[PDB]
Amino acid sequence: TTSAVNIYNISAGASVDLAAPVTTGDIVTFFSSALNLSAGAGSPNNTALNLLSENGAYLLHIAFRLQENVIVFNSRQPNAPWLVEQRVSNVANQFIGSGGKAMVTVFDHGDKYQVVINEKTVIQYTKQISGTTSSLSYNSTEGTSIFSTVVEAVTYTGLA
Amino acid sequence: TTSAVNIYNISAGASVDLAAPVTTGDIVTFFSSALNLSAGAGSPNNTALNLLSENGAYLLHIAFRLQENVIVFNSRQPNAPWLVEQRVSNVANQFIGSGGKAMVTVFDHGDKYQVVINEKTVIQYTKQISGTTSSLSYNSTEGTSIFSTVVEAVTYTGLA
């Protein structure tokens, strides 16, 4: 009845507090104005996108590792070790059909997180930790990020 | 469970067939890489965005008229006159907080269409005609469109 759109500019190395939290049924899309599939090696993550809970837990962690040619999805409670991680091989293969820019979409299916790169679904992630997303972060390895220094994020909340 | 993201490049003067139709609960966002709030007068519409049914009906018509400083929302069946139109005054006032670009979002609330410009909801439109959206069009008055010649459209379907 009263859905909402919120726009955020996220500089590399930062985290932003969402004006409106993301919960079951809502969406989050990240827009990158550049694509560098051959920029270098990450220590270990070239670029990471994170969905965080109000408690500081990493609901969803998305990491792109060029040197290891893989994409990692994991979670963890604050001050706790990294949990069971799911990985997807072939980075470039996922960005086929980009052309100087990319977008990553995350659907919050309540009990799962659907991750989409452009138009291709790369994985149906099962939530290891539950809860609403209240902040987002974009971290990088200095100079080897595969996305622009500033990444735009649009959230669609108050849906279903 | 299996939502989908589809990306389209819509050149001014064209209409594109959606690979995935837009129905109750789905979303459509238009991205413009430019904003010209002082480009000229439309004959009468400077730029119009349309959601069309498989039968050619204009489910939702969105028109920006600089000379008349208003935004019109209407509908109509094919080969029929224009129906009851809703208008919103003050064009620029809606794009406050743009900065060289804009985005228009349309939420299909089943019995209504919620139109958002950037983060501001401009109107809750009551459907005069129902049905799923199968194609979209971007029409302009030669040389006086307030959006870029090519407008990007992203649809989020198969949601609720």
Ligand SMILES: O=S(=O)(O)O[C@H]1[C@@H](O)[C@@H](CO)O[C@@H](O[C@H]2[C@H](O)[C@@H](O)[C@H](O)O[C@@H]2CO)[C@@H]1O
């Ligand atoms: O920047 S970090 O968040 O600290 O990077 C860590 C994360 O990317 C997690 C993701 O689960 O992985 C850590 O590396 C793991 C590696 O994926 C795993 O294969 C290996 O067995 O253990 C490493 C250390 O936990 C990143 O360091």
Ligand SMILES: O=S(=O)(O)O[C@H]1[C@@H](O)[C@@H](CO)O[C@@H](O[C@H]2[C@H](O)[C@@H](O)[C@H](O)O[C@@H]2CO)[C@@H]1O
């Ligand atoms: O390019 S058109 O689609 O033919 O432009 C028409 C539309 O913008 C409709 C929107 O309902 O309006 C038409 O003009 C109206 C005008 O807004 C209204 O005030 C007057 O009563 O009737 C006109 C003709 O229906 C546009 O021509």
